[PDB]
Design an enzyme around this catalytic site. Structure first.
Site, PDB file in Angstrom:
ATOM      1  N   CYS A 108     -36.828 -21.566  -0.751  1.00 61.33           N
ATOM      2  CA  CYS A 108     -35.846 -20.727  -0.077  1.00 61.33           C
ATOM      3  C   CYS A 108     -35.797 -20.935   1.427  1.00 61.33           C
ATOM      4  O   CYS A 108     -36.783 -20.720   2.134  1.00 61.33           O
ATOM      5  CB  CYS A 108     -36.126 -19.256  -0.377  1.00 61.33           C
ATOM      6  N   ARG A 111     -35.764 -17.414   3.996  1.00 61.51           N
ATOM      7  CA  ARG A 111     -36.882 -16.487   4.048  1.00 61.51           C
ATOM      8  C   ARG A 111     -37.062 -15.677   5.333  1.00 61.51           C
ATOM      9  O   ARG A 111     -37.820 -14.706   5.350  1.00 61.51           O
ATOM     10  CB  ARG A 111     -38.173 -17.224   3.692  1.00 61.51           C
ATOM     11  N   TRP A 280     -27.193 -13.731   0.241  1.00 65.32           N
ATOM     12  CA  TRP A 280     -25.873 -14.175   0.642  1.00 65.32           C
ATOM     13  C   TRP A 280     -25.867 -15.698   0.693  1.00 65.32           C
ATOM     14  O   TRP A 280     -26.898 -16.334   0.830  1.00 65.32           O
ATOM     15  CB  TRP A 280     -25.429 -13.536   1.972  1.00 65.32           C
ATOM     16  N   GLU A 285     -23.780 -24.371  -0.479  1.00 69.35           N
ATOM     17  CA  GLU A 285     -24.018 -24.102  -1.888  1.00 69.35           C
ATOM     18  C   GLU A 285     -22.709 -24.165  -2.662  1.00 69.35           C
ATOM     19  O   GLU A 285     -22.664 -24.645  -3.790  1.00 69.35           O
ATOM     20  CB  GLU A 285     -24.652 -22.723  -2.084  1.00 69.35           C
TER      21      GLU A 285
HETATM   22  C1  HEM Z   1     -30.375 -13.756   2.639  1.00 74.00           C
HETATM   23  C2  HEM Z   1     -29.751 -14.797   2.021  1.00 74.00           C
HETATM   24  C3  HEM Z   1     -30.429 -15.884   1.496  1.00 74.00           C
HETATM   25  C4  HEM Z   1     -30.078 -17.159   1.753  1.00 74.00           C
HETATM   26  C5  HEM Z   1     -29.004 -17.581   2.770  1.00 74.00           C
HETATM   27  C6  HEM Z   1     -30.898 -18.002   0.894  1.00 74.00           C
HETATM   28  C7  HEM Z   1     -30.614 -19.355   0.656  1.00 74.00           C
HETATM   29  C8  HEM Z   1     -31.156 -20.074  -0.419  1.00 74.00           C
HETATM   30  C9  HEM Z   1     -30.713 -21.379  -0.802  1.00 74.00           C
HETATM   31  C10 HEM Z   1     -29.646 -22.198  -0.089  1.00 74.00           C
HETATM   32  C11 HEM Z   1     -31.486 -21.780  -1.861  1.00 74.00           C
HETATM   33  C12 HEM Z   1     -31.245 -22.988  -2.791  1.00 74.00           C
HETATM   34  C13 HEM Z   1     -30.250 -22.568  -3.860  1.00 74.00           C
HETATM   35  C14 HEM Z   1     -29.843 -23.702  -4.793  1.00 74.00           C
HETATM   36  O1  HEM Z   1     -29.803 -24.874  -4.361  1.00 74.00           O
HETATM   37  O2  HEM Z   1     -29.539 -23.421  -5.963  1.00 74.00           O
HETATM   38  C15 HEM Z   1     -32.475 -20.732  -2.061  1.00 74.00           C
HETATM   39  C16 HEM Z   1     -33.498 -20.787  -3.014  1.00 74.00           C
HETATM   40  C17 HEM Z   1     -34.272 -19.685  -3.345  1.00 74.00           C
HETATM   41  N1  HEM Z   1     -34.162 -18.418  -2.790  1.00 74.00           N
HETATM   42 FE1  HEM Z   1     -33.073 -17.866  -1.264  1.00 74.00          FE
HETATM   43  N2  HEM Z   1     -31.788 -17.224   0.102  1.00 74.00           N
HETATM   44  C18 HEM Z   1     -31.496 -15.910   0.497  1.00 74.00           C
HETATM   45  C19 HEM Z   1     -32.020 -14.774  -0.131  1.00 74.00           C
HETATM   46  C20 HEM Z   1     -32.948 -14.804  -1.146  1.00 74.00           C
HETATM   47  C21 HEM Z   1     -33.469 -13.614  -1.757  1.00 74.00           C
HETATM   48  C22 HEM Z   1     -33.063 -12.159  -1.429  1.00 74.00           C
HETATM   49  C23 HEM Z   1     -34.478 -14.037  -2.585  1.00 74.00           C
HETATM   50  C24 HEM Z   1     -35.344 -13.263  -3.381  1.00 74.00           C
HETATM   51  C25 HEM Z   1     -35.485 -11.914  -3.287  1.00 74.00           C
HETATM   52  C26 HEM Z   1     -34.493 -15.472  -2.523  1.00 74.00           C
HETATM   53  C27 HEM Z   1     -35.234 -16.270  -3.410  1.00 74.00           C
HETATM   54  C28 HEM Z   1     -35.040 -17.645  -3.547  1.00 74.00           C
HETATM   55  C29 HEM Z   1     -35.736 -18.430  -4.522  1.00 74.00           C
HETATM   56  C30 HEM Z   1     -36.810 -17.946  -5.506  1.00 74.00           C
HETATM   57  C31 HEM Z   1     -35.285 -19.696  -4.357  1.00 74.00           C
HETATM   58  C32 HEM Z   1     -35.825 -20.928  -5.060  1.00 74.00           C
HETATM   59  C33 HEM Z   1     -35.435 -20.779  -6.515  1.00 74.00           C
HETATM   60  C34 HEM Z   1     -35.944 -21.908  -7.380  1.00 74.00           C
HETATM   61  O3  HEM Z   1     -37.130 -22.296  -7.216  1.00 74.00           O
HETATM   62  O4  HEM Z   1     -35.146 -22.384  -8.228  1.00 74.00           O
HETATM   63  N3  HEM Z   1     -33.522 -15.964  -1.659  1.00 74.00           N
HETATM   64  N4  HEM Z   1     -32.214 -19.630  -1.233  1.00 74.00           N
HETATM   65  C1  LIG Z   2     -30.547 -14.936  -4.610  1.00 75.48           C
HETATM   66  C2  LIG Z   2     -29.254 -15.302  -3.873  1.00 75.48           C
HETATM   67  S1  LIG Z   2     -29.644 -16.275  -2.399  1.00 75.48           S
HETATM   68  C3  LIG Z   2     -28.591 -17.737  -2.278  1.00 75.48           C
HETATM   69  N1  LIG Z   2     -28.081 -18.093  -1.122  1.00 75.48           N
HETATM   70  N2  LIG Z   2     -28.313 -18.443  -3.357  1.00 75.48           N
HETATM   71  C4  LIG Z   2     -29.152 -18.937  -4.403  1.00 75.48           C
HETATM   72  C5  LIG Z   2     -28.527 -19.671  -5.452  1.00 75.48           C
HETATM   73  C6  LIG Z   2     -29.311 -20.177  -6.533  1.00 75.48           C
HETATM   74  C7  LIG Z   2     -30.728 -19.958  -6.560  1.00 75.48           C
HETATM   75  C8  LIG Z   2     -31.595 -20.491  -7.730  1.00 75.48           C
HETATM   76  F1  LIG Z   2     -32.602 -19.588  -7.998  1.00 75.48           F
HETATM   77  F2  LIG Z   2     -30.817 -20.653  -8.861  1.00 75.48           F
HETATM   78  F3  LIG Z   2     -32.148 -21.694  -7.384  1.00 75.48           F
HETATM   79  C9  LIG Z   2     -31.344 -19.224  -5.505  1.00 75.48           C
HETATM   80  C10 LIG Z   2     -30.568 -18.723  -4.434  1.00 75.48           C
END
Ligand code: HEM
Ligand SMILES: CCS/C(N)=N\c1ccc(C(F)(F)F)cc1
Ligand code: HEM
Ligand SMILES: C[C@H](O)[C@H](O)[C@H]1CNc2nc(N)[nH]c(=O)c2N1
Ligand SMILES: C[C@H](O)[C@H](O)[C@H]1CNc2nc(N)[nH]c(=O)c2N1
Ligand SMILES: CCS/C(N)=N\c1ccc(C(F)(F)F)cc1
Ligand SMILES: [Zn+2]
Lengths: 410, 407
Positions: A108, A111, A280, A285
Site C-alpha cells: 500500500c 499508508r 480513495w 488505478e
Molecule cells: C487512503 C487511500 C488509499 C490509497 C490512495 C491507497 C492506494 C493503494 C494502491 C494504489 C494500492 C494497489 C492497488 C492495486 O494495484 O490493486 C494499494 C494496495 C493496498 N492497500 Fe491501499 N490505499 C489507500 C487506503 C487503504 C486502506 C484504508 C487500507 C486498509 C485499511 C489499505 C490497504 C491496502 C492493502 C492491503 C493493499 C495491498 C493489497 C494486496 O496485497 O493485494 N489501503 N493501496
Molecule cells: C481499499 C481501497 S484503497 C485503493 N486506492 N485501492 C485499492 C484497490 C485494490 C486493492 C487490492 F487489495 F485489491 F489489491 C487495494 C487497494
C-alpha cells in the site's frame, strides 16, 4: 542486526531494525527471489502465543507494557482461550489491530493515512441482511458525498471455519462483466466469473457496460444472498477530458469508492474473513489499469484512433501518448465532481515522507517495490529510486481462497 | 524444487527447474526480500572449472566423452601447477555468450547467441587496450547498424596486475560542477570527469563532452586516450512535430558499451571485458534525460510545450516524458542508427522467455529491472511473474578502480 536501504536520487540511507520482528515467510529463499510473484482453524496451542505478542504490542503502544492492566488482560485471554478455545478482542484492541493491519500492508502506497481509519464493529452481526445494512452504512459514511473517508467494517471472526462470514464480491462496488457467445466481453472482463455466479443465484443483469454488481453476502457459514446497493449511495464519475471534447462521447465513467472486500484480517491469531475496507483512488488505478490493461476495458486503440495518432508503428509511442491523456481525464473528472482522488506523483511523494518517518519512529517500513511503483511514469516518481525491504508483520491483511471454491452449499 | 510462473495477462503458466542449478545467493531470505536493493584458490578454482566444462560439453553433446574427461584432467593438472588455467577459444566464446544469457537484468537477451567475441587475452599494455577498444567500437558501431560485441582482456592473476577500464562505459559525457553549485554535463560522471582532469585531460567544459578512455593494464596506472571522433557515432535529438525541439540542443551517442563490470567463466575472472549492444529508447529518454539526478530536462521541455506546470495533477511531467521519448526514437531512426522501443523490446523478451523455458527449463529474470521506467503496465513484462536467481558464467559488479588502486 541492521539493514541499510538507499535512495539513489537523494543518496539518503536508512537503517531497518523493524524487520527483526518479522516472523512470517516471504516466499523467497537464499537461492531465489520471488519478489514479482503475485500470490506466494487455528488450534489453542498455536493461538495464545499469537495473542500474547499482539497484546504485548498493544500495551507497548499505549505505554502500559508490564502494567497490571497488561498482565490481567494476558491472564484473562489465556483463560478464555483455554475454556472457549478462542477469545474476543476489546474494542480498543480491534481498532488498534485494524489500523496496524493497514500500517503493515507493504503493498500500500497510501499508508501515510494509516492512523486516520474509521473502524466499524460489525461483530454482533448474524445474518446476510444484517451484513447488507452494515455495508450500506459503510458505503454512505466513507463516500461522504465525494469527500472520501477511510473506513473498515469488521464482521465476526472465524470459529471452526464452518461458520465463516464472507463478502463474495472482490470490491463492494464493481462493474459486471459478461462473456458473449461471439467470444468478446461486455463490461469488465475481470468480473465475468463473479457476474455469472450472481446471475446463477438469481441476479437479473441489465447486461450493460457499467452495471454495478449486486452484493453476494455470506453470514455465519450459510449460503450467500443477493442484495442491490442503493443506487443513490453509489457515487460515480463520468469521465471527460479537459481539452478533448470527444472524450465524454467515449461513454466512460467509474465509481468513486474503492472498497476491498475479499481479504482476510488477522489480529492476534484471530481471523476475520469478512472485513471490507475502503479509502480513495490513486488515479493510475483507473486510468492505467482498469481502463488500459489489455484484459480490462482496453480503451487504448479507441482513444488513440480518435486522437488521430500514428498507430502504424509502436515506436511512435501512440500507446504511451494516449495513456497520459486518459489519466489526465480521470484526475480532471474526479476533481471536477469534487470527489477525492490522488495522482501518482503526490501519492508517491507522500509515501516517501511517510516511509522515512516510519524508519525514524518504528525502525522500518515494509514495502513491496513491485507494487508501490506506479504502472506508468515509474522512474519520474520518487519511489522508483527507493530501495525497499519487504517482510511480514501482523496484524495483517491476507488473501483467502475465493469463497465459491470452498463453500459447502446447504 | 519445481516452481511455476504465471503471466496474468495471458494466463500462460511456465514451470522453472533451471533455478535448481543456482550457486550464489540472492541477498533474500525467507524472512526478507531484498529484490529492490541495487546490489546486496586451487581448492576453490577446480570445482568451478569442472562445473563449467561440464556445462560446456553438455551443450556440445560430448558429456563424458574422452575429450570432456581429458580436458578436465588437463585443467585439473594445470590448476595444480599454474594455480589457474586458460580457456580454449571455444570455451571463451561460449562463456561470454552465456554470461549474457544469464544476465537477469537484461531485457534484450533474445539476442544472446548473436555476440561477437574479441579475444584480447594477448594484450600487455594500455596502448594495446586502446587499439582493441577502438576496433571494438568501430566493429560494433558498423555505421549505425550496430552489432553486439565484447572484448576480453587478460584474466586476473594475483589481483595486483588487473586489467581495468576506469570508464563506466566506453562512451559517456563529462560531468562538471559549476561555480553556482549546479552541474554542467552529466552529474553521473562528475567524479570520473574529475579524475580525468586530475590526470591531464583538457576538459572543454561543454554540456556533451565525450570523455577520454582511462585504461589500466597489468596492474599499472591508467592512461588517457581520445577515441577517434570519427568512431563516436552521435545522434542530434529532434522532434517529429515540434520544430522547436532542436533548440533544446540535445544529443546522445549510439553505442552503449558497458565496461566497468567483471566477467566470470569457470572460476576465472576477467576484470576488463567491455561489451555493447544497442539502446532501448527509454534508457536515454526516461533515465538519462529525465532522471532528476541526471540531465533532468523535464522542467524546460514542459515549458516549451506550454502546459500547466502549476499542479502535478495535470500530469505535465508525464506529458513531457512521452514527447521526449518520441524524439529520441525519432532521431535514431532518421539517422538509421539501431535502437529499440520499450514495447518491442519487452515483447521480444517475453518470446525469449518462452523459448528459454522449454529449451533450458527457465530464464532468470529481475522484474524490477526488466520493466521499463515508463508505461510499465502497458508492456507485457509487467504482467509476467519472474523468478530471479544467479547462474554462471556471469557479469558482476566490481569496486570502482580508483577506490582500490595503489598508484
Ligand atoms: C487512503 C487511500 C488509499 C490509497 C490512495 C491507497 C492506494 C493503494 C494502491 C494504489 C494500492 C494497489 C492497488 C492495486 O494495484 O490493486 C494499494 C494496495 C493496498 N492497500 Fe491501499 N490505499 C489507500 C487506503 C487503504 C486502506 C484504508 C487500507 C486498509 C485499511 C489499505 C490497504 C491496502 C492493502 C492491503 C493493499 C495491498 C493489497 C494486496 O496485497 O493485494 N489501503 N493501496
Ligand atoms: C481499499 C481501497 S484503497 C485503493 N486506492 N485501492 C485499492 C484497490 C485494490 C486493492 C487490492 F487489495 F485489491 F489489491 C487495494 C487497494
Ligand atoms: C543488443 C541489445 C541489447 C539491449 C536492447 C539491451 C538492453 C538492456 C537494458 C534496457 C538494460 C538496463 C540498463 C540500465 O538500466 O542501466 C540492460 C541491462 C543489462 N544488459 Fe543488456 N541489452 C542488450 C545487449 C547486451 C549485451 C550485448 C550484453 C552482454 C554481452 C548485455 C548485458 C547486460 C547486463 C549485464 C545488464 C545488467 C547489468 C547489471 O546487473 O547492472 N546486454 N540491457
Ligand atoms: C506479475 C507482477 O507481479 C504483477 O503484474 C504485479 C506488478 N505490480 C503491481 N502493482 C500494483 N500496484 N498492482 C498490481 O496488480 C501489480 N501487478
Ligand atoms: C532502487 C531501485 O532498485 C532502482 O531505482 C532500480 C529499479 N529498476 C531499475 N531498472 C533498470 N533497468 N535500471 C535501473 O537503474 C533501475 N534502478
Ligand atoms: C551493453 C549495452 S546494452 C544497453 N542497452 N544498455 C546498457 C546500459 C547500462 C548497463 C549497466 F550495466 F550499466 F547496467 C547495461 C546495458
Ligand atoms: Zn526476494
Amino acid at each position: 542486526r541492521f539493514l541499510k536501504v538507499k535512495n539513489w536520487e537523494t543518496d539518503v540511507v536508512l537503517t531497518d531494525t523493524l524487520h527483526l520482528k518479522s516472523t512470517l515467510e516471504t516466499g523467497c529463499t537464499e537461492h531465489i527471489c520471488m519478489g514479482s510473484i503475485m500470490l506466494p482453524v487455528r488450534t489453542k496451542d498455536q493461538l495464545f502465543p499469537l495473542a500474547k505478542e499482539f497484546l504485548d504490542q498493544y500495551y507497548s503502544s499505549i505505554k502500559r507494557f508490564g502494567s497490571k492492566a497488561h498482565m490481567d488482560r494476558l491472564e484473562e485471554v489465556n483463560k478464555e482461550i483455554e475454556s472457549t478455545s478462542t477469545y474476543q478482542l476489546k474494542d480498543t484492541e480491534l481498532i488498534y489491530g485494524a489500523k496496524h493491519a493497514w500500517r503493515n500492508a507493504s503493498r500500500c502506497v497510501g499508508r501515510i493515512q494509516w492512523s486516520k481509519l474509521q473502524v466499524f464493529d460489525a461483530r454482533d452481526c448474524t445474518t446476510a441482511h444484517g451484513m447488507f445494512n452494515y455495508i450500506c452504512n459503510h458505503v454512505k459514511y466513507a463516500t461522504n458525498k465525494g469527500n472520501l473517508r477511510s473506513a473498515i467494517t469488521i464482521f465476526p471472526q472465524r470459529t471452526d471455519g464452518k461458520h465463516d462470514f464472507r463478502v463474495w464480491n472482490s470490491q463492494l462496488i464493481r462493474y459486471a462483466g459478461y462473456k458473449q457467445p461471439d467470444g468478446s466481453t461486455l463490461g469488465d472482463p475481470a468480473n465475468v466469473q463473479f457476474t455469472e455466479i450472481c446471475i446463477q443465484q438469481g441476479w437479473k443483469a441489465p447486461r450493460g457496460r457499467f452495471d454495478v454488481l449486486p452484493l453476494l453476502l455470506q453470514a455465519n457459514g450459510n449460503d450467500p444472498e443477493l442484495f442491490q446497493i442503493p443506487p443513490e449511495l453509489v457515487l460515480e464519475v463520468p469521465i471527460r477530458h479537459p481539452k478533448f471534447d470527444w472524450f465524454k462521447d467515449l461513454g466512460l465513467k467509474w465509481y468513486g469508492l474503492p472498497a476491498v472486500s475479499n481479504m482476510l484480517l488477522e489480529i492476534g491469531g484471530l481471523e476475520f474473513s469478512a472485513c471490507p475496507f475502503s479509502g480513495w483512488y490513486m488515479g493510475t488505478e483507473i486510468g492505467v489499469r482498469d481502463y488500459c490493461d489489455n484484459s480490462r476495458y482496453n480503451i487504448l486503440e479507441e482513444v488513440a484512433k480518435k486522437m488521430d495518432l500514428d498507430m502504424r508503428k509502436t515506436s511512435s509511442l501512440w500507446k504511451d501518448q494516449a495513456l497520459v491523456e486518459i489519466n489526465i481525464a480521470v484526475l480532471y473528472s474526479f476533481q471536477s465532481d469534487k470527489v477525492t482522488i490522488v495522482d501518482h506523483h503526490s501519492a508517491t511523494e507522500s509515501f516517501i515522507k511517510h516511509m522515512e518517518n516510519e524508519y525514524r519512529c518504528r525502525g522500518g517500513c515494509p514495502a513491496d517495490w513491485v507494487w508501490i511503483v506506479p504502472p506508468m511514469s515509474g522512474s519520474i516518481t520518487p519511489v522508483f529510486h527507493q530501495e525497499m525491504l519487504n517482510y511480514r508483520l501482523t496484524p495483517s491483511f491476507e488473501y483467502q481462497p475465493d469463497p465459491w471454491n470452498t463453500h459447502v452449499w446447504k
